[PDB]
Coordinates of C-alpha atoms and ligand atoms in Angstrom, one line a residue:
Chain A
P1 CA 43.6 -7.0 -16.2
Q2 CA 40.2 -8.3 -15.2
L3 CA 36.9 -7.2 -14.1
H4 CA 36.8 -7.2 -10.3
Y5 CA 34.1 -7.4 -7.8
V6 CA 34.5 -5.4 -4.7
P7 CA 33.1 -4.8 -1.4
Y8 CA 32.1 -1.6 -0.1
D9 CA 34.2 -1.7 2.7
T10 CA 37.6 -1.7 0.3
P11 CA 40.5 0.2 0.8
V12 CA 40.5 3.3 -1.5
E13 CA 43.8 2.6 -2.2
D14 CA 42.9 -1.0 -3.4
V15 CA 40.4 0.6 -5.7
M16 CA 42.8 3.0 -7.3
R17 CA 44.9 0.4 -7.7
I18 CA 42.2 -1.7 -10.0
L19 CA 41.4 1.2 -11.7
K20 CA 45.1 2.1 -12.7
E21 CA 45.4 -1.9 -13.5
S22 CA 42.3 -2.6 -15.0
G23 CA 41.0 0.6 -15.4
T24 CA 37.2 -0.3 -14.3
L25 CA 35.7 -2.6 -11.6
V26 CA 32.5 -3.0 -9.5
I27 CA 31.8 -1.8 -6.3
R28 CA 29.1 -3.9 -4.9
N29 CA 26.1 -2.2 -2.3
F30 CA 27.2 1.3 -3.7
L31 CA 24.0 2.7 -2.4
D32 CA 21.2 0.8 -0.7
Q33 CA 18.0 -0.3 -1.4
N34 CA 16.4 2.5 0.1
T35 CA 18.1 5.3 -2.1
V36 CA 17.4 2.5 -5.3
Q37 CA 13.8 3.0 -4.7
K38 CA 13.8 6.5 -3.9
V39 CA 15.7 7.4 -6.9
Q40 CA 13.1 5.2 -9.3
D41 CA 10.1 6.7 -7.3
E42 CA 11.3 10.3 -8.3
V43 CA 12.2 9.6 -12.3
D44 CA 9.3 6.8 -12.9
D45 CA 7.2 9.8 -14.5
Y46 CA 10.2 11.2 -15.7
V47 CA 11.4 8.4 -18.0
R48 CA 8.3 7.2 -18.8
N49 CA 7.2 10.6 -20.9
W50 CA 11.0 10.8 -22.4
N51 CA 10.9 9.6 -25.7
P52 CA 13.4 6.6 -26.9
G53 CA 16.3 7.9 -28.9
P54 CA 18.4 11.0 -28.8
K55 CA 17.3 14.7 -28.6
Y56 CA 19.4 16.3 -31.2
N57 CA 21.7 15.6 -33.6
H58 CA 25.6 14.9 -33.1
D59 CA 28.3 12.8 -34.5
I60 CA 28.6 10.0 -31.8
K61 CA 25.2 8.4 -32.4
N62 CA 25.2 5.9 -29.8
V63 CA 21.3 6.2 -28.5
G64 CA 19.6 3.4 -29.9
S65 CA 15.9 3.5 -31.1
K66 CA 14.7 1.6 -28.1
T67 CA 17.0 3.5 -25.8
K68 CA 16.2 6.1 -23.5
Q69 CA 18.7 8.9 -21.5
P70 CA 17.2 11.4 -19.6
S71 CA 19.3 13.7 -17.9
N72 CA 18.7 16.7 -15.9
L73 CA 18.8 15.0 -12.9
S74 CA 19.5 17.2 -10.2
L75 CA 16.5 19.0 -11.2
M76 CA 14.2 15.8 -11.4
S77 CA 15.3 13.8 -8.1
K78 CA 15.6 15.3 -4.8
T79 CA 17.7 12.3 -3.8
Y80 CA 20.2 12.7 -6.7
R81 CA 21.0 16.3 -5.8
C82 CA 20.5 15.7 -2.0
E83 CA 22.1 12.3 -1.4
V84 CA 23.6 10.8 -4.7
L85 CA 26.1 13.7 -5.7
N86 CA 27.5 13.6 -1.7
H87 CA 28.5 10.2 -2.2
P88 CA 32.0 9.7 -0.4
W89 CA 33.0 7.1 -2.6
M90 CA 32.9 9.3 -6.0
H91 CA 34.6 12.1 -3.6
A92 CA 37.2 9.9 -2.8
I93 CA 37.8 8.7 -5.9
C94 CA 37.8 11.9 -7.9
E95 CA 39.8 13.6 -5.6
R96 CA 42.5 11.4 -6.2
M97 CA 42.2 11.1 -9.8
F98 CA 41.8 15.1 -10.6
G99 CA 43.5 16.8 -7.7
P100 CA 47.0 16.5 -8.2
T101 CA 47.0 18.2 -11.6
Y102 CA 43.7 19.9 -12.0
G103 CA 42.9 21.1 -8.4
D104 CA 39.3 20.9 -8.1
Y105 CA 36.7 18.9 -10.1
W106 CA 32.7 19.2 -10.8
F107 CA 29.8 17.6 -12.2
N108 CA 30.0 17.0 -15.8
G109 CA 27.0 15.0 -16.6
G110 CA 24.6 12.7 -15.5
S111 CA 21.7 10.7 -17.3
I112 CA 19.1 7.3 -16.9
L113 CA 20.1 4.8 -19.0
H114 CA 16.9 2.6 -19.7
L115 CA 17.3 -0.2 -22.0
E116 CA 13.8 -0.8 -23.3
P117 CA 13.2 -4.8 -24.3
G118 CA 14.8 -5.6 -28.0
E119 CA 17.4 -2.7 -27.8
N120 CA 20.0 -3.9 -29.9
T121 CA 24.1 -3.7 -28.5
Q122 CA 25.6 -0.3 -28.0
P123 CA 28.5 0.2 -30.1
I124 CA 31.8 0.3 -28.0
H125 CA 33.2 3.5 -27.4
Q126 CA 35.2 5.5 -24.8
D127 CA 33.6 8.1 -22.9
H128 CA 35.9 11.1 -23.3
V129 CA 35.7 10.9 -27.4
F130 CA 33.6 13.7 -27.2
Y131 CA 37.1 15.9 -26.0
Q132 CA 39.2 17.3 -28.9
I133 CA 42.1 17.6 -26.1
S134 CA 41.7 12.9 -25.9
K135 CA 43.9 12.8 -28.9
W136 CA 46.0 15.4 -26.9
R137 CA 46.3 13.1 -24.1
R138 CA 48.7 10.4 -23.7
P139 CA 47.3 7.2 -21.9
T140 CA 49.6 7.8 -19.0
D141 CA 47.6 11.1 -18.3
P142 CA 45.0 11.4 -16.1
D143 CA 41.6 10.6 -17.5
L144 CA 39.5 13.6 -18.7
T145 CA 36.3 12.6 -17.1
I146 CA 34.9 9.3 -14.7
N147 CA 31.6 7.8 -14.8
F148 CA 29.5 6.1 -12.4
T149 CA 27.1 3.6 -13.6
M150 CA 24.6 2.4 -10.9
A151 CA 21.9 -0.2 -11.3
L152 CA 18.2 0.5 -10.4
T153 CA 17.2 -2.4 -11.9
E154 CA 19.3 -6.0 -12.4
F155 CA 22.5 -6.3 -14.8
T156 CA 22.7 -9.4 -16.4
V157 CA 24.3 -10.5 -19.9
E158 CA 21.0 -11.2 -21.5
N159 CA 18.9 -7.7 -20.3
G160 CA 22.0 -5.3 -21.8
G161 CA 24.2 -5.0 -18.9
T162 CA 27.2 -2.7 -19.5
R163 CA 29.8 -4.8 -20.7
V164 CA 33.7 -3.4 -20.5
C165 CA 37.2 -4.3 -22.0
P166 CA 39.9 -4.4 -18.8
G167 CA 43.0 -3.1 -19.9
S168 CA 41.5 -0.8 -23.0
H169 CA 42.5 2.3 -21.0
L170 CA 46.3 2.1 -21.3
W171 CA 45.6 1.9 -24.9
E172 CA 47.4 4.3 -27.2
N173 CA 45.2 7.0 -29.4
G174 CA 44.3 5.1 -32.6
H175 CA 44.1 2.0 -31.2
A176 CA 41.0 0.4 -32.7
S177 CA 38.1 -0.6 -31.2
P178 CA 38.1 -3.9 -28.9
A179 CA 36.3 -6.9 -30.7
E180 CA 32.7 -7.4 -29.3
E181 CA 34.2 -11.1 -28.2
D182 CA 36.6 -9.6 -25.9
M183 CA 33.6 -7.3 -23.9
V184 CA 33.3 -8.8 -20.7
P185 CA 29.6 -8.1 -19.6
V186 CA 28.9 -6.4 -15.8
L187 CA 26.8 -8.2 -13.7
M188 CA 25.1 -6.2 -11.0
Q189 CA 22.8 -6.2 -8.5
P190 CA 20.3 -2.9 -7.5
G191 CA 22.7 -0.4 -6.2
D192 CA 25.9 -1.8 -7.4
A193 CA 27.9 0.3 -9.8
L194 CA 30.8 0.1 -12.3
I195 CA 33.4 2.5 -12.2
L196 CA 34.1 3.7 -16.0
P197 CA 37.2 6.4 -16.1
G198 CA 36.6 8.4 -19.6
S199 CA 39.6 6.2 -21.4
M200 CA 37.5 2.3 -20.5
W201 CA 36.0 1.1 -23.6
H202 CA 32.5 -0.1 -23.0
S203 CA 28.9 -0.2 -24.4
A204 CA 25.7 -1.0 -23.1
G205 CA 24.5 -4.8 -24.4
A206 CA 21.3 -6.0 -25.9
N207 CA 18.0 -6.5 -23.6
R208 CA 16.7 -9.7 -25.0
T209 CA 14.7 -10.0 -21.5
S210 CA 11.0 -9.1 -21.6
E211 CA 11.3 -6.3 -18.7
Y212 CA 13.9 -3.0 -19.3
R213 CA 17.0 -2.8 -17.9
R214 CA 17.3 0.8 -16.1
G215 CA 20.7 2.2 -14.2
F216 CA 21.4 6.1 -13.8
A217 CA 25.1 7.7 -13.6
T218 CA 27.0 10.1 -12.6
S219 CA 29.8 11.7 -13.9
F220 CA 32.8 14.1 -13.1
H221 CA 35.7 16.0 -14.3
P222 CA 38.3 18.7 -13.9
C223 CA 37.3 22.2 -13.1
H224 CA 38.9 23.4 -16.1
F225 CA 36.4 21.6 -18.2
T226 CA 33.0 22.8 -19.3
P227 CA 30.4 20.3 -18.3
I228 CA 28.1 19.0 -20.8
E229 CA 25.5 19.9 -18.2
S230 CA 24.4 23.0 -17.3
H231 CA 22.8 23.9 -13.8
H232 CA 21.7 27.5 -13.8
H233 CA 18.3 26.8 -14.8
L234 CA 17.5 25.2 -11.5
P235 CA 15.4 27.0 -8.7
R236 CA 17.3 28.9 -6.0
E237 CA 15.6 27.2 -3.1
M238 CA 17.0 24.1 -5.0
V239 CA 20.7 25.4 -4.8
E240 CA 20.5 27.0 -1.4
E241 CA 19.4 23.5 0.4
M242 CA 22.4 21.6 -1.6
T243 CA 25.6 21.0 0.3
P244 CA 28.5 23.3 -0.5
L245 CA 30.1 20.3 -2.0
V246 CA 27.1 19.6 -4.3
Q247 CA 26.9 23.5 -5.1
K248 CA 30.5 23.3 -6.2
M249 CA 29.8 19.9 -8.2
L250 CA 26.9 21.9 -9.8
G251 CA 28.6 25.3 -11.1
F252 CA 27.4 27.7 -8.2
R253 CA 30.6 28.3 -6.6
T254 CA 34.1 29.5 -7.9
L255 CA 36.6 26.4 -8.5
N256 CA 40.3 26.7 -7.7
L257 CA 43.5 25.1 -10.0
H258 CA 45.9 23.0 -8.9
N259 CA 48.4 25.9 -8.6
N260 CA 45.8 28.3 -6.6
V261 CA 44.5 30.0 -10.1
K262 CA 40.8 30.5 -9.6
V263 CA 38.4 30.1 -12.8
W264 CA 34.5 30.4 -12.5
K265 CA 35.1 33.7 -10.6
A266 CA 32.6 36.8 -9.9
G267 CA 34.9 39.3 -10.8
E268 CA 38.0 39.1 -9.0
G269 CA 36.4 37.6 -6.0
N270 CA 34.1 34.2 -5.6
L271 CA 30.9 33.1 -7.2
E272 CA 28.9 32.7 -4.1
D273 CA 29.8 35.9 -2.5
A274 CA 28.0 37.8 -5.5
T275 CA 25.2 35.7 -5.2
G276 CA 24.7 35.4 -1.8
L277 CA 24.9 32.0 -1.1
Chain B
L1 CA 55.4 43.4 -34.9
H2 CA 53.1 44.4 -37.2
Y3 CA 50.9 47.3 -37.0
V4 CA 47.8 46.8 -39.4
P5 CA 45.1 49.2 -40.1
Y6 CA 41.3 48.7 -39.7
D7 CA 40.5 47.4 -43.0
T8 CA 43.1 44.8 -43.5
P9 CA 41.5 41.9 -44.8
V10 CA 41.0 39.0 -42.5
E11 CA 43.0 36.5 -43.9
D12 CA 46.0 38.9 -43.8
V13 CA 45.8 39.3 -40.2
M14 CA 45.3 35.6 -39.5
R15 CA 48.4 34.9 -41.7
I16 CA 50.5 37.6 -39.9
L17 CA 49.0 35.8 -36.3
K18 CA 50.1 32.7 -37.5
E19 CA 53.5 33.9 -38.6
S20 CA 54.6 36.6 -36.2
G21 CA 52.4 35.4 -33.1
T22 CA 51.3 39.1 -32.7
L23 CA 50.0 42.0 -34.0
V24 CA 48.3 45.4 -33.8
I25 CA 45.3 46.6 -35.4
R26 CA 45.5 50.5 -35.1
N27 CA 41.8 52.0 -34.4
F28 CA 40.4 48.7 -32.7
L29 CA 38.0 50.8 -31.6
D30 CA 37.5 54.7 -31.2
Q31 CA 38.8 56.7 -28.6
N32 CA 35.1 57.4 -27.4
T33 CA 34.0 53.7 -27.0
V34 CA 37.1 53.0 -24.8
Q35 CA 36.9 56.1 -23.0
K36 CA 33.1 55.1 -22.3
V37 CA 33.7 51.7 -20.4
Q38 CA 35.7 53.5 -18.1
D39 CA 33.7 56.4 -17.2
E40 CA 31.0 53.6 -16.8
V41 CA 33.4 51.5 -14.5
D42 CA 34.2 54.3 -12.4
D43 CA 30.4 55.4 -12.0
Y44 CA 29.9 51.9 -11.0
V45 CA 32.5 51.9 -8.4
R46 CA 32.1 55.3 -7.3
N47 CA 35.3 55.4 -5.4
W48 CA 35.6 58.4 -2.9
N49 CA 37.6 61.0 -4.8
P50 CA 38.1 64.1 -2.0
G51 CA 37.7 67.5 -2.9
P52 CA 40.0 70.4 -2.1
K53 CA 38.7 71.4 1.4
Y54 CA 36.7 69.6 4.1
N55 CA 32.9 68.9 3.3
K56 CA 28.0 53.7 -1.5
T57 CA 30.7 52.4 -3.2
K58 CA 31.2 49.1 -4.6
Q59 CA 34.1 46.6 -5.4
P60 CA 35.2 45.8 -9.2
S61 CA 33.5 43.2 -10.2
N62 CA 33.1 41.8 -14.1
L63 CA 33.6 44.0 -16.9
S64 CA 30.5 43.2 -18.8
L65 CA 28.3 43.9 -15.3
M66 CA 30.1 47.7 -14.8
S67 CA 30.2 48.9 -18.1
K68 CA 27.0 48.6 -20.6
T69 CA 29.3 49.4 -23.5
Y70 CA 31.6 46.9 -22.9
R71 CA 28.9 44.1 -22.7
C72 CA 26.7 45.1 -25.4
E73 CA 29.7 46.8 -27.9
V74 CA 33.0 45.6 -27.1
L75 CA 31.8 42.0 -26.8
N76 CA 30.0 42.1 -30.1
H77 CA 33.5 43.8 -31.9
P78 CA 33.5 42.2 -35.5
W79 CA 36.9 42.0 -35.3
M80 CA 37.2 39.5 -32.0
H81 CA 34.9 37.4 -33.5
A82 CA 36.4 37.4 -37.1
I83 CA 39.6 36.1 -35.2
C84 CA 38.0 33.4 -32.8
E85 CA 35.9 31.8 -35.6
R86 CA 39.0 31.2 -37.4
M87 CA 41.4 30.2 -34.5
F88 CA 38.9 27.9 -32.3
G89 CA 36.0 27.1 -35.3
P90 CA 37.4 24.4 -37.2
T91 CA 38.8 22.7 -34.2
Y92 CA 36.7 23.1 -31.1
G93 CA 33.5 24.6 -32.8
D94 CA 31.8 27.2 -30.6
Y95 CA 33.8 30.1 -28.2
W96 CA 33.0 32.1 -25.4
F97 CA 34.3 34.6 -23.0
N98 CA 37.1 33.6 -21.0
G99 CA 37.7 36.8 -19.0
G100 CA 38.0 40.2 -19.0
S101 CA 40.4 43.1 -17.1
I102 CA 40.9 46.6 -16.5
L103 CA 44.5 47.2 -17.2
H104 CA 45.7 50.1 -14.8
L105 CA 49.7 50.3 -14.1
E106 CA 50.3 53.2 -11.6
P107 CA 53.1 55.0 -12.0
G108 CA 56.2 53.5 -10.7
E109 CA 54.9 49.7 -11.0
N110 CA 58.2 47.6 -12.1
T111 CA 58.2 45.1 -14.9
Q112 CA 55.5 42.5 -15.0
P113 CA 57.5 38.9 -15.5
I114 CA 57.5 37.7 -19.1
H115 CA 54.8 34.9 -19.4
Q116 CA 52.5 33.1 -21.7
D117 CA 48.8 33.5 -21.1
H118 CA 47.8 29.9 -21.4
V119 CA 50.2 28.7 -18.7
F120 CA 47.3 28.2 -16.1
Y121 CA 46.0 25.5 -18.6
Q122 CA 47.4 22.2 -17.5
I123 CA 46.7 20.6 -21.2
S124 CA 49.2 23.4 -22.3
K125 CA 51.8 21.2 -21.8
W126 CA 50.2 18.8 -24.0
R127 CA 49.9 21.4 -27.0
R128 CA 52.0 21.2 -30.2
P129 CA 53.1 24.8 -31.0
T130 CA 51.6 24.0 -34.3
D131 CA 48.1 23.4 -32.7
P132 CA 45.4 26.2 -32.2
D133 CA 45.7 28.5 -29.5
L134 CA 44.1 27.7 -26.3
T135 CA 42.9 31.4 -25.8
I136 CA 43.4 34.9 -27.2
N137 CA 43.6 37.7 -25.5
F138 CA 42.5 41.5 -27.1
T139 CA 44.3 44.2 -25.5
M140 CA 42.8 47.8 -25.9
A141 CA 44.6 51.0 -25.0
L142 CA 42.7 53.6 -23.3
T143 CA 45.8 55.7 -23.1
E144 CA 48.6 56.2 -25.1
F145 CA 51.1 52.9 -25.1
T146 CA 54.9 54.2 -24.5
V147 CA 58.1 52.8 -24.0
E148 CA 57.8 54.9 -20.7
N149 CA 54.5 54.4 -19.3
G150 CA 55.0 50.4 -19.7
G151 CA 53.5 49.8 -22.7
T152 CA 53.2 46.1 -23.0
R153 CA 56.2 44.2 -24.7
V154 CA 56.0 41.0 -27.3
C155 CA 58.4 38.5 -28.6
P156 CA 57.4 37.9 -32.2
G157 CA 58.2 34.4 -33.6
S158 CA 57.7 33.4 -29.9
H159 CA 54.8 31.4 -30.1
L160 CA 56.5 28.9 -32.1
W161 CA 58.7 27.8 -29.7
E162 CA 58.6 24.2 -28.0
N163 CA 57.0 23.9 -24.7
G164 CA 59.4 24.0 -22.2
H165 CA 61.7 26.6 -24.0
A166 CA 63.5 29.2 -21.9
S167 CA 61.6 32.8 -21.3
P168 CA 63.0 35.5 -24.2
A169 CA 65.7 37.3 -23.2
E170 CA 64.5 41.0 -22.0
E171 CA 67.2 42.8 -24.5
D172 CA 64.8 41.4 -27.0
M173 CA 61.5 42.5 -25.9
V174 CA 59.7 44.2 -28.9
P175 CA 57.7 47.4 -27.2
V176 CA 54.2 47.8 -28.7
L177 CA 53.3 51.4 -29.3
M178 CA 49.5 52.0 -29.4
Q179 CA 47.3 55.4 -29.6
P180 CA 44.1 55.5 -27.8
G181 CA 41.8 53.0 -29.4
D182 CA 44.3 50.5 -31.1
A183 CA 44.6 46.9 -30.0
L184 CA 47.0 44.6 -29.1
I185 CA 46.3 40.6 -30.1
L186 CA 48.0 38.3 -27.9
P187 CA 47.5 34.5 -28.5
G188 CA 47.8 32.3 -25.5
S189 CA 51.1 31.5 -26.6
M190 CA 52.8 34.4 -26.9
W191 CA 55.2 35.6 -24.8
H192 CA 55.1 38.8 -23.4
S193 CA 54.9 41.2 -20.5
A194 CA 53.7 44.8 -19.3
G195 CA 56.8 47.0 -19.1
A196 CA 57.6 49.5 -15.9
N197 CA 55.2 52.9 -16.0
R198 CA 58.4 55.3 -15.0
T199 CA 56.0 58.4 -16.3
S200 CA 54.0 60.5 -13.9
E201 CA 50.7 59.1 -15.3
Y202 CA 48.2 55.8 -15.3
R203 CA 48.5 53.5 -18.2
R204 CA 44.6 53.0 -18.9
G205 CA 43.2 50.1 -20.8
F206 CA 41.0 46.8 -20.8
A207 CA 41.0 43.6 -22.1
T208 CA 39.1 41.0 -23.5
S209 CA 39.3 37.0 -23.8
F210 CA 37.8 33.9 -25.6
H211 CA 38.5 30.4 -25.4
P212 CA 37.1 26.8 -26.6
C213 CA 33.9 26.4 -25.3
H214 CA 34.6 22.9 -23.8
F215 CA 37.3 25.2 -21.7
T216 CA 36.1 26.8 -18.3
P217 CA 36.0 30.3 -18.3
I218 CA 38.4 32.4 -15.9
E219 CA 35.0 35.0 -15.1
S220 CA 31.4 33.3 -14.3
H221 CA 28.6 35.8 -15.1
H222 CA 25.9 34.0 -13.4
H223 CA 25.5 37.0 -11.2
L224 CA 24.3 39.5 -13.8
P225 CA 21.1 40.8 -13.4
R226 CA 18.4 39.2 -15.9
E227 CA 17.7 42.4 -17.8
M228 CA 20.9 42.6 -18.4
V229 CA 21.1 39.1 -20.0
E230 CA 18.1 40.0 -22.0
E231 CA 19.0 43.2 -23.5
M232 CA 22.3 41.7 -24.8
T233 CA 22.8 40.1 -28.3
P234 CA 22.7 36.6 -28.5
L235 CA 26.3 36.1 -29.4
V236 CA 27.0 37.9 -25.9
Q237 CA 25.0 35.8 -24.3
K238 CA 26.5 32.5 -25.6
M239 CA 29.8 34.8 -25.0
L240 CA 29.0 35.1 -21.4
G241 CA 27.5 31.4 -20.6
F242 CA 24.4 31.6 -21.0
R243 CA 23.5 29.8 -23.7
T244 CA 24.4 25.9 -24.8
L245 CA 27.3 25.3 -26.5
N246 CA 28.3 23.5 -29.8
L247 CA 31.3 21.5 -30.0
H248 CA 33.3 20.5 -33.6
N249 CA 31.4 16.8 -33.3
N250 CA 28.0 18.5 -33.1
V251 CA 27.5 17.3 -29.3
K252 CA 26.4 20.1 -26.7
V253 CA 27.9 21.0 -23.8
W254 CA 26.3 23.3 -21.2
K255 CA 23.0 22.3 -21.8
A256 CA 19.9 22.3 -19.4
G257 CA 19.8 18.3 -19.3
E258 CA 19.0 17.3 -22.8
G259 CA 17.9 20.7 -24.5
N260 CA 19.5 24.1 -24.5
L261 CA 19.9 26.4 -21.6
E262 CA 18.4 29.7 -23.3
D263 CA 15.4 27.6 -23.8
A264 CA 14.9 26.3 -20.1
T265 CA 15.6 29.9 -18.7
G266 CA 13.2 31.5 -21.0
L267 CA 15.9 33.7 -22.8
Ligands
0I3_1 C1 25.4 8.3 -25.7 C2 26.7 9.0 -25.8 C3 26.8 9.8 -27.2 O1 27.9 8.0 -26.2 C4 29.1 8.1 -25.9 O2 29.2 6.9 -26.9 C5 29.8 8.7 -25.8 C6 29.6 9.7 -24.9 C7 28.8 10.4 -24.4 C8 28.5 12.1 -25.2 C9 27.5 9.7 -24.7 C10 26.2 10.8 -24.2 C11 26.1 11.6 -22.6 C12 27.8 11.1 -22.3 C13 27.9 12.7 -21.4 C14 28.7 12.3 -19.9 C15 29.4 13.6 -19.3 C16 27.1 12.0 -19.3 C17 26.6 10.8 -19.8 C18 26.4 9.9 -19.1 O3 25.8 9.5 -17.9 O4 26.4 8.6 -19.8 C19 26.8 9.0 -21.5 C20 27.1 10.2 -21.0 C21 28.8 9.9 -20.8 C22 29.2 8.9 -19.9 C23 29.2 9.7 -22.1 C24 28.7 10.8 -22.8 C25 29.0 11.2 -20.0 O5 30.5 11.4 -20.2
OGA2 O1 23.3 2.2 -20.7 C1 24.9 1.2 -20.2 O2 24.8 0.2 -19.9 C2 26.1 1.9 -20.7 N1 25.9 3.5 -21.5 C3 26.8 4.3 -21.7 O3 27.9 3.8 -21.7 C4 26.5 5.3 -22.5 O4 25.1 5.7 -22.7 O5 27.4 6.1 -22.5
FE2_3 FE1 29.3 5.7 -22.1
FE2_4 FE1 49.2 38.6 -19.7

């Protein structure tokens, strides 16, 4: 297994092969320069006023003192919720990853990944560690989550670009963390995206440049799992402008399981019916 | 199958749950409370009842939306929270409401298939019988539960069976005989089934169910009016999905960005 840089027009069966083989890859030109600049324009004041460091106390202390990870992106970015969440590559991969086992999937969470100059290396980790059921899951099973880390600024070795350990997703539970010397930094242009299944060991690097390294992420997981981020605080007019696909992603529609059982229902009917969506 | 009084110590009930997989708590509710839920539900659906001579109806929604007693009193029942705290707490942290249904077997209904309640969790095929349950059901009886009217039957000890084990034989199913107000405790791994109602009258009752906070509930209560959410207790607000949940590792799920959902919605 190795790091792979594939173009946008890669066949889907080739991408899922690399995900099955190496557990990660980079899709170049995942977004265009227009979407990158629009996302930066919408979250500029948000991230600037956000305070560096975690917001609350939890066990996985992987938020550095010089790191900003604001979420709430569907609420603070129109391009995020109207276009980014409808990205065909995300839904093409998510359908083949969760479909045959869980049925529907929806949005788990998504945050800005902002590395201030001088930030040290993030601890190497798997994204699904905050799932208690990850101890039950064998590495042959489908992943509990998948992440889409999109570069807004450049991602270099020196400015703290994300590093992955290809092949570490196939390790059995309890396997020790990969050594730092085994981490492989990811080189990305603005708009490129690194695909991170919940089982791939990875971490942010140290930002040893004079300029911040900023990315932003989306993540999806099976519909039977509670998302880290709710969206019932969003204004009603926002939901009605969302596509039906994004409405389901953000928790406003009933979800169907793989055997046609429904969860997230309003009584016995659909949640969208009782709300008038 | 154990029948225990209401004042049974919590440690005793959890011990019988671990060993037998089910039991009944007699007088779980007073007969008044169970009756009020039905009356409030009937007053909600407002089905047309024809009189003896000639001379605005809603479909059934969530039980917490239909019945004020259900969402304000039944969902705050200390016995359910005492059991859910000890079954989900150490492993999962928070728990919340999974789903609730009105259980009415009309006269003539055949025997329901024997099943486990956690069969619709795909992750049930990774769980070991000694692991904590994925969900727990509390079935409260409004009418009497008898053999003839199709009262629920259980197979004690079948919760320890390996995954893939065959369903228990019908000859080895134990009928649960409950008076109005009692409640049958059904963890997700207990093999059970409703019986055949061979009497002339309905078998009435309802159920609540809870599961770990990291699992998506069967029912969403997002359509509930804001006035109803505000009058709920903070415990019930979290139960019905209006509050941020805390995992065992103190990582929060169901947040509003990085903060709490109840703070963003002004609860
Ligand atoms: C910083 C920390 C503690 O670091 C960790 O080591 C491990 C896991 C989490 C709890 C992150 C913080 C929030 C999460 C949640 C989310 C669904 C969406 C967030 C995101 O977009 O990037 C971080 C994401 C993550 C990709 C990883 C996961 C993900 O699954
Ligand atoms: O910021 C990055 O490059 C990578 N961040 C993470 O993996 C995280 O925050 O979980
Ligand atoms: Fe991560
Ligand atoms: Fe059942």
